[PDB]
Amino acid sequence: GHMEHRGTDIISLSQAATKIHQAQQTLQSTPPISEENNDERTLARQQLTSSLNALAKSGVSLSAEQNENLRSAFIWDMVSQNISAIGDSYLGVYENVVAVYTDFYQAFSDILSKMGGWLLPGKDGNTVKLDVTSLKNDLNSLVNKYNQINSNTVLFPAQSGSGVKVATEAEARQWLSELNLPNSSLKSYGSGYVVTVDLTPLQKMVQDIDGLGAPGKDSKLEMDNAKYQAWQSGFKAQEENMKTTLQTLTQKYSNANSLYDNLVKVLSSTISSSLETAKSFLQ
Ligand code: NI
């Protein structure tokens, strides 16, 4: 126990520091907005835990100060199992939440981009013509696509392959509450439950369109500017509801990513103190 090996300790700790920093670079710069990006993020976490496993077998010994720092934040075996759990069951879910909601919200954006072509001149400068039928039809089509249970619609559990991974009602409700989503986002499927995107603003938009009254013979609805503006204000409010839901989810993702990054910083700082120890000697 008297034989020192500073050279190997420095190489081992440096290797770990490098793998951790590379994973951290990925996790800070890659947005969780597509399956491809989340694959990259998941790989970075696998690389990080592999590096801790390699560090555990290396020979480097931590001090009481460092052992304690690690116990309170999260021995190398326990740190690896704990951080893996957080990446997979917490940050990994949030990444899925954002990628799925991204694509859903993009579909909604594409509908909104058509709305200029659905507003026509009225008979005079006090009236407009809204194509209520085309607008209703596109919105209903979005509802019907995202009302299904598949990899396009399921926020939790994260999905892969051709089966539908489901959770217990208790587990799904926890995530429903965590995500601040309405009860309608909790769906039974087969033997369990899933959490899905919130369609209620779109459904409300469609109701409000019908509330305008039956279209004319062209399937479009003539309205005075006052009626139109009031409808537009109501439509905008529903768009704002969806925007707020997405905003909440992306912020919550970011904080889950910050919580994981705080743990990564503890790892980095532990390794950097050990590196100082390997390089230093009392006069
Ligand atoms: Ni010895």
DSSP string for residues in 171-191: HHHHHHHHHT--GGGEEEETT
How far apart (Å, rounded) are the C-alpha atoms in residues 118 and 123? 16
Phi/psi zone of residue 137: left (φ > 0), alpha (ψ -120 to 50 degrees), beta?
A: alpha
**Ligand 1 centroid to residue 18 C-alpha, Å:** 30
Please tell me whether the peptide bond between 157 and the residue prior to it is cis, using omega within 30 degrees of 0: yes
How far apart (Å, rounded) are the C-alpha atoms in residues 117 and 144? 23
What is the identity of the amino acid at 22? Q
**Ligand 1 centroid to residue 66 C-alpha, Å:** 22
**Ligand 1 centroid to residue 151 C-alpha, Å:** 57
How far apart (Å, rounded) are the C-alpha atoms in residues 273 and 14? 12
If we measure between CA atoms, which residue out of 203, 253, 228 comes closest to residue 97? 253
**Ligand 1 centroid to residue 59 C-alpha, Å:** 13
Question: Residues 6 or more apart from 75 whose CB is under 8 A from it?
Answer: 62, 67
Q: Which domain holds residue 182?
A: 1-283
Neighbours of ion ligand 1 (CB under 5 A): 1-3
If we measure between CA atoms, which residue out of 176, 20, 30 comes closest to residue 83? 20
Taking CA atoms, 100 is separated from 131, 183, 228, 248, in Å, by 30, 18, 33, 14
What is the identity of the amino acid at 194? V
**Ligand 1 centroid to residue 4 C-alpha, Å:** 8
**CA count, 13 A, side-chain hemisphere, 70:** 23
**Ligand 1 centroid to residue 6 C-alpha, Å:** 14
Q: Check if the beta carbon of residue 40 is closer than 8 Å to that of residue 26.
A: yes
**Ligand 1 centroid to residue 275 C-alpha, Å:** 21
**Ligand 1 centroid to residue 191 C-alpha, Å:** 59
Resolution (A): 1.9
How far apart (Å, rounded) are the C-alpha atoms in residues 108 and 66? 50
For strands 154-156 and 192-196, give the pairing.
antiparallel
**Ligand 1 centroid to residue 61 C-alpha, Å:** 14
Question: Residues 6 or more apart from 58 whose CB is under 8 A from it?
Answer: 8, 9, 12, 13, 16
**Ligand 1 centroid to residue 95 C-alpha, Å:** 48
**Ligand 1 centroid to residue 149 C-alpha, Å:** 62
- DSSP lists the bridge partners of residue 156 as 195
Look-up of token digits 């995530």: 175
- DSSP lists the bridge partners of residue 222 as 129
**Ligand 1 centroid to residue 60 C-alpha, Å:** 14
Domain count, the chain: 1
If we measure between CA atoms, which residue out of 180, 210, 207, 205 comes closest to residue 195? 180
* Angle between helix 92-112 and helix 132-146 axes, rounded to 10 deg: 160
Q: What is the CATH number of the domain that holds 182?
A: 1.20.1710.10
Give me the long-range contacts of 17-24 (CB less than 8 A, separation at least 24).
17/268, 17/271, 17/272, 17/275, 19/47, 19/48, 19/50, 19/51, 20/48, 20/51, 20/264, 20/267, 20/268, 20/271, 21/268, 22/47, 23/47, 23/48, 23/51, 23/264, 24/48, 24/261, 24/264, 24/268
- DSSP lists the bridge partners of residue 221 as 130
